[PDB]
Amino acid sequence: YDIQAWKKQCEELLNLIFQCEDSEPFRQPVDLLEYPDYRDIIDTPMDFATVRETLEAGNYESPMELCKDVRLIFSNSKAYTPSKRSRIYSMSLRLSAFFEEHISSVLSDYKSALRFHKR
Ligand SMILES: C[C@@H]1CN(C(=O)c2cccn2C)CCN1C(=O)NCC1CC1
């Protein structure tokens, strides 16, 4: 019932994600001028370094907010892929599965802790 525990759990999960080779495409923001069409497709860029920085700045209030940003990484990758014959999209789908399998308990524990606090 620790209301704050999600933060270190999310830091540890980001550490695992950064270690995963499947995160390579997503670790840093897209150079908009390198992939010049990117901002025509993607209204809100997101990447794992931004997520970590947001977390470390104390600018997430809940793991749900972090989750929303991580899921945006994946939706952006899907929106930008030209095909499934892309190593990047393939990596996004695997990393997404990994993230979702690991974030579920974080979310559950946090929401449980909040409920207990309000009981
Ligand atoms: C811009 C695209 C798509 N892409 C993204 O969308 C992205 C970057 C950070 C967060 N996200 C969600 C990944 C990088 N990428 C590439 O094509 N890199 C490999 C190309 C053969 C050279």
XYZ file of C-alpha atoms and ligand atoms in Angstrom:
141
model
C 0.000 0.000 0.000
C 2.950 2.307 -0.662
C 1.500 5.147 -2.767
C 4.985 6.249 -3.903
C 6.411 2.801 -4.838
C 5.485 3.105 -8.534
C 8.186 5.657 -9.191
C 11.222 3.445 -8.480
C 9.400 0.511 -10.097
C 9.003 2.617 -13.251
C 12.674 3.721 -13.101
C 13.724 0.068 -12.870
C 11.419 -0.877 -15.723
C 12.835 1.925 -17.892
C 16.304 0.594 -17.037
C 15.289 -2.835 -18.358
C 13.752 -1.225 -21.440
C 16.948 0.723 -22.169
C 18.968 -2.481 -21.883
C 16.677 -4.226 -24.374
C 17.931 -4.052 -27.957
C 14.322 -3.569 -29.116
C 14.327 -0.088 -27.508
C 17.150 1.205 -29.694
C 14.829 3.035 -32.137
C 12.919 4.679 -29.326
C 15.573 5.852 -26.851
C 15.841 9.419 -28.177
C 13.611 11.915 -30.060
C 13.351 11.811 -33.841
C 15.360 14.394 -35.682
C 12.421 16.035 -37.447
C 14.633 17.259 -40.318
C 16.312 13.827 -40.686
C 12.874 12.147 -41.025
C 11.304 15.321 -42.445
C 7.736 13.956 -42.725
C 7.661 12.912 -39.071
C 5.804 15.923 -37.588
C 3.202 15.782 -40.390
C 2.214 12.331 -39.142
C 3.005 12.572 -35.425
C 1.313 15.331 -33.419
C 3.143 14.447 -30.184
C 6.658 12.956 -30.351
C 7.613 10.754 -27.448
C 10.649 8.634 -26.625
C 12.004 6.755 -23.630
C 14.575 9.395 -22.692
C 11.779 11.979 -22.505
C 9.711 9.563 -20.357
C 12.630 8.970 -17.980
C 13.403 12.694 -17.818
C 9.736 13.470 -17.063
C 9.769 10.887 -14.300
C 13.055 12.071 -12.830
C 11.848 15.702 -12.927
C 8.912 14.727 -10.747
C 6.465 15.596 -13.512
C 4.450 12.401 -13.410
C 1.812 12.196 -10.685
C 0.929 8.562 -11.325
C 2.169 5.531 -13.229
C -0.945 5.855 -15.437
C 0.496 9.097 -16.824
C 3.817 7.415 -17.550
C 1.972 4.557 -19.200
C 0.093 6.943 -21.413
C 3.398 8.390 -22.643
C 5.014 5.006 -23.193
C 1.929 3.846 -25.132
C 2.279 7.001 -27.261
C 5.778 5.827 -28.187
C 4.209 2.677 -29.595
C 1.264 4.384 -31.291
C 3.639 6.858 -32.905
C 5.790 3.993 -34.218
C 2.677 2.302 -35.654
C 1.467 5.534 -37.256
C 4.846 6.152 -38.856
C 5.658 2.639 -40.105
C 5.170 2.112 -43.899
C 4.738 -1.652 -43.458
C 5.176 -4.620 -41.113
C 8.292 -5.370 -43.182
C 9.998 -2.883 -40.833
C 12.465 -3.921 -38.132
C 11.297 -0.824 -36.185
C 7.614 -1.628 -36.042
C 8.457 -5.265 -35.204
C 10.628 -4.081 -32.325
C 7.829 -1.737 -31.162
C 5.378 -4.631 -30.966
C 7.748 -6.823 -28.928
C 8.785 -3.986 -26.639
C 5.129 -3.060 -26.184
C 4.328 -6.615 -25.082
C 7.268 -6.554 -22.651
C 6.247 -3.155 -21.273
C 2.604 -4.143 -20.840
C 3.535 -7.394 -19.067
C 5.736 -5.473 -16.617
C 3.594 -2.349 -16.057
C 0.413 -4.255 -15.123
C 1.522 -4.957 -11.509
C 2.824 -1.396 -11.122
C -0.581 0.005 -12.072
C -2.407 -2.549 -9.976
C -0.303 -1.898 -6.886
C -0.619 1.856 -7.262
C -4.390 1.786 -7.690
C -4.638 -0.612 -4.717
C -2.547 1.719 -2.565
C -4.707 4.688 -3.514
C -7.884 2.777 -2.716
C -6.480 1.792 0.685
C -5.521 5.408 1.358
C -9.080 6.523 0.606
C -10.760 3.582 2.424
C 11.711 7.754 -37.295
C 11.565 6.253 -37.458
C 10.432 5.707 -36.618
N 10.759 5.784 -35.197
C 9.932 6.411 -34.312
O 8.749 6.627 -34.616
C 10.407 6.827 -32.946
C 11.669 7.310 -32.559
C 11.635 7.590 -31.186
C 10.355 7.280 -30.754
N 9.621 6.799 -31.800
C 8.210 6.332 -31.669
C 11.995 5.065 -34.846
C 13.164 5.551 -35.673
N 12.815 5.552 -37.101
C 13.560 5.031 -38.120
O 13.090 4.999 -39.262
N 14.807 4.629 -37.828
C 15.474 3.560 -38.565
C 15.540 3.907 -40.043
C 16.120 2.916 -41.031
C 16.882 4.213 -40.691
